[PDB]
Amino acid sequence: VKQDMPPVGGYGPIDYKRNLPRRGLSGYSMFAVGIGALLFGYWSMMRWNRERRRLQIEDFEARIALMPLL
Amino acid sequence: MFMINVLTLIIPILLAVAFLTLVERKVLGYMQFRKGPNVVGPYGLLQPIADAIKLFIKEPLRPATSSISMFILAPILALTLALTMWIPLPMPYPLINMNLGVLFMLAMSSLAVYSILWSGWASNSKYALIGALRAVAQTISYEVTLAIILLSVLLMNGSFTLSTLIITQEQVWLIFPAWPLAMMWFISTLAETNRAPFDLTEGESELVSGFNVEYAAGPFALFFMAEYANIIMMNIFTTTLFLGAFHNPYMPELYTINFTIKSLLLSITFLWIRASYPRFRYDQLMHLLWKNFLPLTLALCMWHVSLPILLSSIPPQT
Ligand SMILES: CCCCCCCCCCCCCCCCCC(=O)OC[C@H](COP(=O)([O-])OCC[N+](C)(C)C)OC(=O)CCCCCCCCCCCCCCCCC
DSSP states (O other): OOOOOOOTTOOOOOOOSOOOOOOSOOHHHHHHHHHHHHHHHHHHHHHHHHHHHHHHHHHHHHHHHHTTTO | OHHHHHHHHHHHHHHHHHHHHHHHHHHHHHTTTSOOOOTTTGGGTTHHHHHHHHHTSSOOOOOSSSOHHHHHHHHHHHHHHHHTTSTTSOSSSOSSOOTTHHHHHHHHHHHTHHHHHHHHHHSOOHHHHHHHHHHHHHHHHHHHHHHHHHHHHTTTTOSSOSTTHHHHTTSSOTTTTOHHHHHHHHHHHHHHTTOTTSOOSSOTTTSSSGGGSSOOTTHHHHHHHHHHHHHHHHHHHHHHHHOOOOOBTTBHHHHHHHHHHHHHHHHHHHHHHHTTOOOOOTTHHHHHIIIIIHHHHHHHHHHHHHHHHHHTOOOOOO
8 A cells, every 4th residue: 555654754843932032242241342342432532622723723813814804 | 417416326325225125025034044036137126126116016006985185185195204314314415415414314104104104094994093003103202312312423423414424423433432322323223114023004913004004005004115216325325424424525436335335234124123023012212212211311302402512522514
């Protein structure tokens, strides 16, 4: 006879359980990364803002020099 | 000559809106294990043309119980406000170089809500009224936090001018020292345009279509292009605010390419968010911004007003 049957040793394994691998970093790591990014941004902003203030002072004194003729 | 400039501003954004419909459909299909439109033309390049020609040869269907004057005025106001609020954006030179462009965009974003409100009220239907009141709730949820976020992030720029924002980010990006404000701003821009997961006005689950349920083809397309031009303008605004690119005065095409690809990535992130999240309830969105975002926004505003005084880093206003 010929029918639809499983083999002698059966079929392979079949999963039925929830699989969540829990990928990622701990909270301390991401918080430290954020704090370091904030500090780097603050330092770069302080340097560029001081330079921009000096440039603005230079332009203002240029206007001071040009004022009496106008 | 200024007519040439304004038409070359307003026609490519309409073409961008149509191809944004195409890109939205195709990308959203590909994130859902399927294909987008590819049968209309070569890789579906002619689908927005077919949609636009189809929608403008259909019946308008003005209802009998609706006040016709407001019913016509509301989509006109929506498309108009979506058009004359792209202007102050520097690309890298804005068409209109306003000294107070940030407040201008805030005011005209507050004004665009009235189109949704009058569309809901004008068409005499209960679902339209529900959509209009949900728009009101969304506006009172997001507006104050959005304005305080903008004020706190503009304390490092120096002034409200959008043209000087490139000079501020000439050294480093503005997302490095203001990334919590950047995240809160991104959520605020998501909730501003009634985009997912804060749709809540064109809700196809709780309602049928919301405020535009009585708007048939022709006027219905106006709200669609207004919404899509709005999301592109929010993406460009966020790119200018937090991702300022290198600008060469001799080669503006470098800045144009840079902020173009950055705004494209931001729109791709918008559609990425759209396909992956369930819809918020409109009372949970109300308690989201008023309880979680607002105290942190106030604390960050005090931090950003006490920071440049602390460090001798007060930016110039000229
Ligand atoms: C523009 C750049 C990119 C931005 C990100 C864009 C891509 C990512 C998008 C992700 C998907 C977003 C989909 C919409 C989500 C909507 C929900 C939502 O946002 O809820 C917000 C939720 C709200 O929480 P909730 O909704 O769960 O409410 C909890 C309510 N209780 C507690 C009562 C149960 O979170 C926030 O509001 C957080 C805002 C950002 C916080 C940033 C903190 C920065 C660090 C501060 C300092 C910390 C250290 C301690 C102090 C140290 C001092 C030195």
